[PDB]
Amino acid sequence: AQNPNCNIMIFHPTKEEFNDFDKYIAYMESQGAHRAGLAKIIPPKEWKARETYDNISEILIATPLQQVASGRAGVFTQYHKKKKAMTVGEYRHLANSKKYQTPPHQNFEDLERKYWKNRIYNSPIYGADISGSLFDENTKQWNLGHLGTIQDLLEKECGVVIEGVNTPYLYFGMWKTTFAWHTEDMDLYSINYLHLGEPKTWYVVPPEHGQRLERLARELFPGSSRGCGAFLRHKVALISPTVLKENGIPFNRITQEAGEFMVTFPYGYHAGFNHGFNCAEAINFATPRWIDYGKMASQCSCGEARVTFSMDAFVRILQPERYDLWKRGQD
């Protein structure tokens, strides 16, 4: 069995290997990459996402989100308070202000220490979940707006044609902006490209051990667990590496820098934080290997998780017994 310790693997495809996206994912899996839940892909030196970022300041962040924490430093939830619209140029100036900027630090490890010590005492503002793309239309390789759709994959594998669309999302971050512990909708893959700015640190639990994280989360957030049988779908809970180690939960960590891709694999729980002002693009995708994970994915029916239009058909075809209850949650 390849990669039996479930380590995060890093890949350096050549420009020739960068042509065929599906083939390269399958290659990484042949080497055991999926066992970690997360892989890094460094693009060939010849490749670029677009010519420059000199012209992005006029993108609008219609609903910036202030991420307010509750709990203790290593075990907390966050809620999102909506703020007034601002441009990316306005948000970048805010990120660089004395109130929000990255503190002085020695290296990524010192910064990670400071994040876990101090995160709860601040409320950073995240420009998350903005429909759109920064890839040039002429970029032919690993262009996240030109990928094969999940609807087309389901049709190819299973024969059934369904409604729905699959488009990318932009994320503008600042110091301490946080993504809570989660898997993707319907336990899909994700791919994330860091277009510019400061790094993003990731934590990940191997898919074979995801239920150990779920059992810990039920213990640590006991009210939330009584409220919903899949409350990590709410994407509000944080647990630090120190607390995971104290509880014996297998995990790994890695830092993504500008110009690098990360892929998350079906049922790979992940969480993390941004080091300073940055911009990332991400989208969900599927392969043949996903279908069995989609059939078994948990679902929130309490009403909190509220998701996209396109998830209806996935539930309806892959999970017909759950469909009725899940849709009551959505309405």
Ligand X SMILES: O=C(O)CNC(=O)C(=O)O
Enumerate residues preceding breaks in the chain (C to N > 2.5 Å).
none
Closest approach of Cβ 260 to Mg ion, in Å? 23
The Cα–Cα gap between 322 and 315 comes to 7
237, 280, 300, 311: which one binds ligand X (CB under 6 A)? 280
- Is 302 a binding residue for Zn ion by CB under 5 A? The answer is yes
Considering only the stretches 25-33, 58-66, 124-132, 293-301, report the one whose residues sit in contact with Zn ion under the rule CB under 5 A.
293-301
Of the pair 56, 254, the CB lying nearest Mg ion is at: 56
Closest approach of Cβ 50 to Mg ion, in Å? 12
Of the pair 58, 331, the CB lying nearest Mg ion is at: 58
What the block records as the tokens of 172 is 């503008």
Residue 125: beta bridge partners?
A: 66
146 belongs to an annotated ligand binding site: no
Closest approach of Cβ 305 to Zn ion, in Å? 5
300 belongs to an annotated ligand binding site: yes
Of the pair 56, 217, the CB lying nearest Zn ion is at: 217
Considering only the stretches 44-52, 53-61, 148-156, 297-305, report the one whose residues sit in contact with Zn ion under the rule CB under 5 A.
297-305
- Is 307 a binding residue for Zn ion by CB under 5 A? The answer is no
The candidate with the shortest Cα–Cα distance to 104, out of 255, 274, 241, 275, is: 275
Quick check: 105 and 118 in contact, CB under 8 A? Answer: no
Helices 311-318, 150-158: axis angle to 10 degrees equals 20
Pairing of strands 9-11, 38-41: parallel
158 belongs to an annotated ligand binding site: no
Binding residues among 219-238 for Zn ion as defined by CB under 5 A: 228
The candidate with the shortest Cα–Cα distance to 111, out of 255, 235, 216, 224, is: 255
Of the pair 129, 324, the CB lying nearest ligand X is at: 129
Task: Please choose which of Zn ion, Ni ion, Mg ion, none residue 257 contacts, taking the beta carbon within 5 to 8 angstroms, the exact cut-off set by kind.
Answer: none
56 CA to centre of own chain: 22
| Three-state secondary structure string covering 33-86 | HHHHCEEEECCCCCCCCCCCCCCCCCCEECCCEEEEEEEECCEEEEEEEECCCE
Of the pair 58, 321, the CB lying nearest Mg ion is at: 58
Residue 189: beta bridge partners?
A: 285
The candidate with the shortest Cα–Cα distance to 182, out of 198, 202, 166, 200, is: 202
Residue nearest to Mg ion (CB): 58
56, 147, 282, 315: which one binds ligand X (CB under 6 A)? 282
Show binding-site residues for Fe cation.
182, 184, 270
Instruction: Provide the annotated binding site.
Output: 126, 182, 184, 192, 200, 228, 234-235, 270, 300, 302
Residues in contact with Zn ion by the rule CB under 5 A: 228, 300, 302, 304
Interface residues toward ligand X, by CB under 6 A: 171, 179, 190, 192, 264, 270, 280, 282
